[PDB]
Amino acid sequence: AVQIGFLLFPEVQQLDLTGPHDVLASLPDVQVHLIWKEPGPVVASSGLVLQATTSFADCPPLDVICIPGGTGVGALMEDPQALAFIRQQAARARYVTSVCTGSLVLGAAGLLQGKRATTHWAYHELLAPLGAIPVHERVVRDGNLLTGTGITAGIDFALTLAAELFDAATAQRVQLQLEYAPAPPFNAGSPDTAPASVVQQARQRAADSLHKRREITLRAAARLAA
Amino acid sequence: AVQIGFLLFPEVQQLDLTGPHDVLASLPDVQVHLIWKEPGPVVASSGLVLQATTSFADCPPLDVICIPGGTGVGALMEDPQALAFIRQQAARARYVTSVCTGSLVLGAAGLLQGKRATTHWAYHELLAPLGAIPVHERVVRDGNLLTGTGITAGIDFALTLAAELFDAATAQRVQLQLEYAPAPPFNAGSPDTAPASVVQQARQRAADSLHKRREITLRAAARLAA
**Annotated catalytic residue A100:** yes
Q: Do B180 and A121 touch (CB under 8 A)?
A: no
- Paired sense of beta strands A30-35 and A64-67, if any: unpaired
Please give the Cα distance from A57 to A61 (Å, whole number).
11
Q: Do A151 and B184 touch (CB under 8 A)?
A: no
Please give the Cα distance from B186 to A180 (Å, whole number).
10
Q: Do A173 and B120 touch (CB under 8 A)?
A: no
Cα A15 versus chain centre, distance: 10
Q: Best interface-test mutation with B: which of A176, A187, A201 has the largest number of B CBs within 10 A?
A: A176
Residue type present at position A106: L
- Paired sense of beta strands A49-52 and A40-43, if any: antiparallel
Q: Which of A2, A42, A50, A100 is catalytic?
A: A100
Cα B28 versus chain centre, distance: 23
Query: Dihedral of CA B57/B59/B61/B67: which sign?
Result: negative
Of residues A156, A169, A179, nearest to B121 (C-beta): A179
Q: What is the DSSP string of B131-178?
A: T-EE--SSEEEETTEEEE-STTHHHHHHHHHHHHHS-HHHHHHHHHHT
Q: Best interface-test mutation with B: which of A152, A157, A200 has the largest number of B CBs within 10 A?
A: A152
Please give the Cα distance from A180 to B153 (Å, whole number).
8
Please give the Cα distance from A40 to A38 (Å, whole number).
6
Q: Which residues pair with B203 in a beta bridge?
A: none
Residues of B with a catalytic annotation lie at: 100
B143: left (phi over 0), alpha (psi -120 to 50) or beta: left
Please give the Cα distance from B130 to B202 (Å, whole number).
24
* Total beta-carbon pairs less than 8 A apart between chain A and chain B: 215
Please give the Cα distance from B114 to A96 (Å, whole number).
50
Residue B175 in contact with residue A186, Cβ under 8 Å? Answer: yes
Half-sphere exposure of B91 (CA within 13 A, CB side): 7
Please give the Cα distance from B30 to B53 (Å, whole number).
15
Q: Do B177 and A13 touch (CB under 8 A)?
A: no
Contacts of A44 in chain B (CB under 8 A): 22
3-state DSSP call for residue B118? coil
Please give the Cα distance from A129 to A145 (Å, whole number).
18
Q: Do B176 and A168 touch (CB under 8 A)?
A: no
Burial B184-220 (b: 16+ CB within 10 A, else e): bebebbbbeebeeebbebbeeebeeeeeebeebbeeb
Q: Do A183 and B32 touch (CB under 8 A)?
A: no
Residue B24 in contact with residue B161, Cβ under 8 Å? Answer: yes
How many residues can be counted in chain A?
Answer: 226
Contacts of A180 in chain B (CB under 8 A): 150-152, 184, 189
Kindly give, in sequence order, each residue whose CB lies less than 8 Å from that of residue A200, ignoring residues fewer than 6 positions away: none
Q: Do B182 and A51 touch (CB under 8 A)?
A: no
Contacts of A194 in chain B (CB under 8 A): 172, 175-176
- First CA to last CA distance, chain A: 38
Contacts of A140 in chain B (CB under 8 A): none
By what method was this entry solved?
X-ray
Please provide residue B206's backbone torsions phi and psi, each rounded to the nearest 5 degrees: -90, -5
Environment class of residue A154 by beta-carbon count within 10 Å: exposed (0-12), middle (13-18) or buried (19+)?
buried
Please provide residue B208's backbone torsions phi and psi, each rounded to the nearest 5 degrees: -65, -45
